[PDB]
Amino acid sequence: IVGGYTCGANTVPYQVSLNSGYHFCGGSLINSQWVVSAAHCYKSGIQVRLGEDNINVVEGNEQFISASKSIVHPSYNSETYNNDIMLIKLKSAASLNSRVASISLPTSCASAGTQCLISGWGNTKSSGTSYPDVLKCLKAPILSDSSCKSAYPGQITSNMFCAGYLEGGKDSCQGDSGGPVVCSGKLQGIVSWGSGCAQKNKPGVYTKVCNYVSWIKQTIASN
Ligand SMILES: N=C(N)c1ccc(O[C@@H]2CO[C@H]3[C@@H]2OC[C@@H]3Oc2cccc(C(=N)N)c2)cc1
Ligand SMILES: [Ca+2]
């Protein structure tokens, strides 16, 4: 997250870190047994880490739980990142508490201008490299589809939306992928892609979760 702030320990209790020996992607807890992330974060051997703030220090509220299965969206395209969403099942149910909490799925899509909360442990530098060890947060609005499409001609589908600032300075970044975009208490987006980070006229692009609520609900009920 570039241009954001330190969230505060466990203030974003649905935020999970995906670990395979190291943090590599964000995710969102959506009930005690399931995580939503981005399909481009797929790999085998995932451990989901819940209740994290400093991902390099055991601070006493963590739950580390291995994935028992991952399900990449049936139409994910790795070239275009269309349908960039995946589900991960926990080998055992998480213990839900004030620091380990699920986030609600949308009932409808959000509209342009809505303010969202984006968070993660990704790079905080627009040029060069600095990874934070504590969770970072950013408030940013959903941009109009025309502004989105204009910045990225031919690359935006109906399953994507842009959020951020066209002026630059504030954006998600490498290492934030898979994490949440929450607007009005609902998971509306997944950190998916962008051009650099926090660059002018290149906002972040997010998976539009509201288009997948039926697939999510049906898939978790059948797995
Ligand atoms: N459909 C496409 N045209 C498109 C499809 C895929 C793609 O991937 C390249 C390689 O990975 C890069 C990059 O994208 C993912 C990542 O950079 C990020 C990751 C997370 C957030 C941000 C951000 N600035 N908000 C950037 C790139 C483009
Ligand atoms: Ca920790």
Short mmCIF file of C-alpha atoms and ligand atoms in Angstrom, two decimals:
data_model
loop_
_atom_site.label_atom_id
_atom_site.label_comp_id
_atom_site.label_asym_id
_atom_site.label_seq_id
_atom_site.Cartn_x
_atom_site.Cartn_y
_atom_site.Cartn_z
CA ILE A 1 0.00 0.00 0.00
CA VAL A 2 1.48 3.32 -1.19
CA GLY A 3 0.43 6.56 0.49
CA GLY A 4 -1.67 4.93 3.19
CA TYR A 5 -1.36 4.65 6.97
CA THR A 6 -0.77 2.06 9.65
CA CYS A 7 -4.15 0.49 10.25
CA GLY A 8 -3.66 -0.35 13.90
CA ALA A 9 -3.33 -3.88 15.16
CA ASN A 10 -6.27 -6.10 14.32
CA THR A 11 -8.45 -3.15 13.21
CA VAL A 12 -9.06 -5.01 9.97
CA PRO A 13 -10.00 -8.36 11.43
CA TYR A 14 -11.05 -10.03 8.15
CA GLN A 15 -7.61 -9.39 6.55
CA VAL A 16 -5.58 -12.53 6.15
CA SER A 17 -2.02 -13.11 5.02
CA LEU A 18 -1.28 -16.09 2.74
CA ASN A 19 2.03 -17.69 3.65
CA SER A 20 4.15 -20.29 1.95
CA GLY A 21 7.22 -19.76 4.04
CA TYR A 22 6.78 -16.01 3.60
CA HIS A 23 3.84 -13.64 3.03
CA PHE A 24 2.99 -13.56 -0.67
CA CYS A 25 -0.67 -12.35 -0.92
CA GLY A 26 -3.61 -10.94 1.01
CA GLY A 27 -7.04 -12.51 1.45
CA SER A 28 -10.40 -11.99 3.18
CA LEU A 29 -12.07 -14.30 5.68
CA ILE A 30 -15.71 -14.72 4.66
CA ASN A 31 -16.74 -17.36 7.21
CA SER A 32 -14.96 -19.57 9.74
CA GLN A 33 -13.86 -22.03 7.04
CA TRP A 34 -13.29 -20.01 3.85
CA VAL A 35 -11.06 -17.30 2.46
CA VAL A 36 -11.50 -15.18 -0.68
CA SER A 37 -8.34 -14.14 -2.56
CA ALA A 38 -7.18 -13.51 -6.09
CA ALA A 39 -6.68 -16.33 -8.55
CA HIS A 40 -3.26 -14.97 -9.55
CA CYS A 41 -2.21 -15.76 -5.93
CA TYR A 42 -2.86 -19.47 -6.48
CA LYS A 43 -0.19 -21.93 -5.42
CA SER A 44 -0.09 -25.21 -3.52
CA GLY A 45 0.98 -25.47 0.09
CA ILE A 46 -0.75 -22.37 1.46
CA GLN A 47 -1.00 -21.51 5.14
CA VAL A 48 -3.61 -18.88 6.01
CA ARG A 49 -2.54 -16.53 8.77
CA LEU A 50 -5.38 -14.83 10.64
CA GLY A 51 -5.28 -12.16 13.35
CA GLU A 52 -2.00 -10.75 12.09
CA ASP A 53 -0.60 -7.27 12.53
CA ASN A 54 3.21 -7.57 12.43
CA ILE A 55 3.73 -10.51 10.15
CA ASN A 56 7.31 -10.96 11.38
CA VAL A 57 6.47 -11.04 15.10
CA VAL A 58 4.18 -13.45 17.01
CA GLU A 59 2.11 -10.94 18.97
CA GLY A 60 -0.38 -13.38 20.49
CA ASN A 61 -3.54 -13.19 18.49
CA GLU A 62 -2.51 -15.23 15.45
CA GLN A 63 -4.15 -18.32 14.09
CA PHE A 64 -2.09 -20.25 11.48
CA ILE A 65 -4.18 -22.78 9.53
CA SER A 66 -3.26 -24.82 6.45
CA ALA A 67 -5.44 -24.75 3.36
CA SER A 68 -7.20 -28.03 2.58
CA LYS A 69 -8.27 -26.99 -0.92
CA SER A 70 -8.11 -24.08 -3.33
CA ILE A 71 -10.64 -23.33 -6.06
CA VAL A 72 -9.67 -20.95 -8.82
CA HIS A 73 -12.58 -19.36 -10.69
CA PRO A 74 -13.65 -21.61 -13.59
CA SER A 75 -13.11 -18.70 -16.09
CA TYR A 76 -9.95 -17.11 -14.69
CA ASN A 77 -7.71 -15.86 -17.48
CA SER A 78 -4.11 -15.48 -16.29
CA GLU A 79 -3.20 -13.31 -19.22
CA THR A 80 -5.82 -10.63 -18.67
CA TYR A 81 -6.61 -11.39 -15.00
CA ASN A 82 -10.29 -11.54 -15.91
CA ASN A 83 -12.19 -13.39 -13.14
CA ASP A 84 -9.26 -12.93 -10.76
CA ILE A 85 -10.80 -14.65 -7.76
CA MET A 86 -10.24 -17.87 -5.85
CA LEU A 87 -11.56 -19.57 -2.73
CA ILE A 88 -9.42 -21.31 -0.11
CA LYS A 89 -10.76 -23.73 2.49
CA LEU A 90 -9.22 -24.00 5.96
CA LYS A 91 -8.23 -27.47 7.15
CA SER A 92 -9.91 -26.53 10.39
CA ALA A 93 -12.37 -23.83 11.26
CA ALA A 94 -11.00 -20.56 12.54
CA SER A 95 -11.97 -19.41 16.02
CA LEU A 96 -13.87 -16.21 15.39
CA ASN A 97 -13.28 -13.44 17.86
CA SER A 98 -12.89 -9.69 17.82
CA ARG A 99 -9.52 -9.91 16.05
CA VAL A 100 -10.44 -12.74 13.69
CA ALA A 101 -13.66 -11.92 11.90
CA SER A 102 -15.44 -12.55 8.66
CA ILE A 103 -16.43 -9.87 6.15
CA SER A 104 -19.90 -9.91 4.51
CA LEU A 105 -20.41 -10.52 0.80
CA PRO A 106 -22.19 -7.82 -1.15
CA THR A 107 -25.89 -7.94 -1.80
CA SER A 108 -25.48 -5.58 -4.73
CA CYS A 109 -22.64 -3.79 -6.50
CA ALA A 110 -21.24 -0.57 -5.21
CA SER A 111 -21.52 2.63 -7.21
CA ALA A 112 -18.87 5.06 -8.47
CA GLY A 113 -17.60 7.50 -5.86
CA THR A 114 -18.22 5.10 -2.99
CA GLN A 115 -15.37 5.25 -0.42
CA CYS A 116 -13.54 2.00 0.23
CA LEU A 117 -10.95 0.60 2.61
CA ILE A 118 -8.01 -1.20 0.99
CA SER A 119 -5.37 -2.91 3.13
CA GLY A 120 -2.27 -5.09 2.98
CA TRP A 121 1.37 -5.79 3.67
CA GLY A 122 2.59 -4.86 0.18
CA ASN A 123 5.23 -2.41 -1.01
CA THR A 124 4.74 1.12 0.30
CA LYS A 125 7.08 2.78 -2.25
CA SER A 126 5.95 4.09 -5.65
CA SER A 127 9.57 3.85 -6.87
CA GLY A 128 11.85 1.23 -5.37
CA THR A 129 11.03 -1.03 -2.49
CA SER A 130 9.94 -1.09 1.13
CA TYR A 131 7.77 -3.72 2.75
CA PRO A 132 6.10 -2.91 5.97
CA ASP A 133 5.82 -5.52 8.64
CA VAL A 134 2.54 -4.13 10.05
CA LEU A 135 -0.74 -3.89 8.08
CA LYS A 136 -1.26 -0.73 6.03
CA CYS A 137 -4.59 0.85 5.08
CA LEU A 138 -5.86 3.22 2.42
CA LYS A 139 -9.17 4.99 1.91
CA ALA A 140 -9.94 5.34 -1.79
CA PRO A 141 -13.02 5.79 -3.95
CA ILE A 142 -14.39 3.66 -6.69
CA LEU A 143 -13.70 5.46 -9.99
CA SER A 144 -16.12 5.62 -12.88
CA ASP A 145 -15.86 2.88 -15.40
CA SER A 146 -15.13 5.43 -18.12
CA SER A 147 -12.14 6.80 -16.22
CA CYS A 148 -11.06 3.21 -15.58
CA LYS A 149 -11.43 2.23 -19.24
CA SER A 150 -9.79 5.38 -20.39
CA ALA A 151 -6.69 4.68 -18.36
CA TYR A 152 -6.54 1.08 -19.57
CA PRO A 153 -8.09 0.85 -23.04
CA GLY A 154 -9.24 -2.60 -24.12
CA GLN A 155 -8.17 -4.16 -20.81
CA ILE A 156 -11.16 -3.62 -18.48
CA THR A 157 -13.98 -6.12 -18.35
CA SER A 158 -17.34 -6.09 -16.54
CA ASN A 159 -15.64 -8.07 -13.72
CA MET A 160 -13.17 -5.28 -12.92
CA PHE A 161 -13.40 -1.80 -11.41
CA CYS A 162 -10.82 0.86 -10.69
CA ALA A 163 -10.31 2.56 -7.42
CA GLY A 164 -7.91 5.18 -6.21
CA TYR A 165 -6.66 8.58 -7.30
CA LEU A 166 -5.87 9.58 -10.89
CA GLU A 167 -3.29 12.12 -9.69
CA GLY A 168 -1.31 9.30 -8.16
CA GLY A 169 0.37 8.96 -4.79
CA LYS A 170 -2.05 6.47 -3.22
CA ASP A 171 -2.67 2.93 -4.44
CA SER A 172 -2.29 -0.75 -3.59
CA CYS A 173 0.93 -2.43 -4.79
CA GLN A 174 2.87 -5.68 -5.17
CA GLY A 175 2.27 -7.87 -2.11
CA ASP A 176 -1.26 -6.44 -1.56
CA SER A 177 -2.69 -8.81 -4.18
CA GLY A 178 -5.61 -10.93 -3.12
CA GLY A 179 -6.52 -8.55 -0.30
CA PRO A 180 -9.78 -6.76 0.45
CA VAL A 181 -11.53 -3.67 -0.88
CA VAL A 182 -14.36 -3.06 1.59
CA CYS A 183 -17.10 -0.48 0.98
CA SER A 184 -19.96 0.03 3.43
CA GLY A 185 -19.22 -3.18 5.34
CA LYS A 186 -19.07 -5.41 2.28
CA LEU A 187 -16.25 -7.05 0.32
CA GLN A 188 -16.61 -5.35 -3.01
CA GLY A 189 -13.16 -5.81 -4.44
CA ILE A 190 -10.01 -7.93 -4.52
CA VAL A 191 -6.58 -6.37 -5.18
CA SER A 192 -5.90 -7.59 -8.70
CA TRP A 193 -3.65 -5.49 -10.88
CA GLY A 194 -2.32 -2.13 -11.97
CA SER A 195 0.52 -0.39 -13.82
CA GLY A 196 3.36 0.22 -11.39
CA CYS A 197 1.94 1.61 -8.14
CA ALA A 198 0.61 5.10 -7.36
CA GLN A 199 1.43 6.36 -10.81
CA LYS A 200 -0.49 9.21 -12.37
CA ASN A 201 -3.44 8.12 -14.54
CA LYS A 202 -2.89 4.47 -13.61
CA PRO A 203 -5.30 3.56 -10.82
CA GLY A 204 -5.52 0.15 -9.20
CA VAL A 205 -7.75 -2.45 -10.79
CA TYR A 206 -9.85 -4.70 -8.58
CA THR A 207 -11.90 -7.82 -9.05
CA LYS A 208 -15.62 -6.91 -8.90
CA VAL A 209 -16.79 -9.31 -6.17
CA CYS A 210 -20.49 -8.58 -6.51
CA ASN A 211 -20.52 -10.49 -9.81
CA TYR A 212 -19.28 -13.60 -8.05
CA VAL A 213 -21.52 -13.87 -4.97
CA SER A 214 -23.64 -16.67 -6.48
CA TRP A 215 -20.58 -18.67 -7.53
CA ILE A 216 -19.02 -18.13 -4.11
CA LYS A 217 -22.10 -19.23 -2.18
CA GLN A 218 -22.72 -22.26 -4.39
CA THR A 219 -19.10 -23.32 -4.37
CA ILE A 220 -18.63 -23.18 -0.61
CA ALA A 221 -21.95 -25.00 -0.07
CA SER A 222 -20.65 -27.82 -2.35
CA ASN A 223 -17.11 -28.10 -0.94
N1 LIG B 1 -5.52 -7.19 -17.69
C1 LIG B 1 -4.31 -6.68 -17.79
N2 LIG B 1 -4.09 -5.77 -18.80
C2 LIG B 1 -3.21 -7.14 -16.79
C3 LIG B 1 -3.23 -8.54 -16.40
C4 LIG B 1 -2.16 -9.02 -15.59
C5 LIG B 1 -1.03 -8.20 -15.03
O1 LIG B 1 0.12 -8.50 -14.12
C6 LIG B 1 1.40 -7.59 -13.95
C7 LIG B 1 2.41 -8.60 -13.27
O2 LIG B 1 2.01 -8.52 -11.89
C8 LIG B 1 1.90 -7.09 -11.74
C9 LIG B 1 1.03 -6.56 -12.88
O3 LIG B 1 -0.29 -6.52 -12.36
C10 LIG B 1 -0.31 -7.18 -11.07
C11 LIG B 1 1.06 -6.74 -10.44
O4 LIG B 1 1.27 -5.30 -9.98
C12 LIG B 1 0.29 -4.93 -8.99
C13 LIG B 1 -0.28 -5.87 -8.01
C14 LIG B 1 -1.27 -5.39 -7.06
C15 LIG B 1 -1.72 -4.02 -7.09
C16 LIG B 1 -1.19 -3.08 -8.07
C17 LIG B 1 -1.65 -1.63 -8.12
N3 LIG B 1 -0.82 -0.72 -8.58
N4 LIG B 1 -2.91 -1.31 -7.71
C18 LIG B 1 -0.17 -3.54 -9.03
C19 LIG B 1 -1.06 -6.80 -15.47
C20 LIG B 1 -2.11 -6.30 -16.35
CA CA B 2 2.28 -11.66 13.90
#
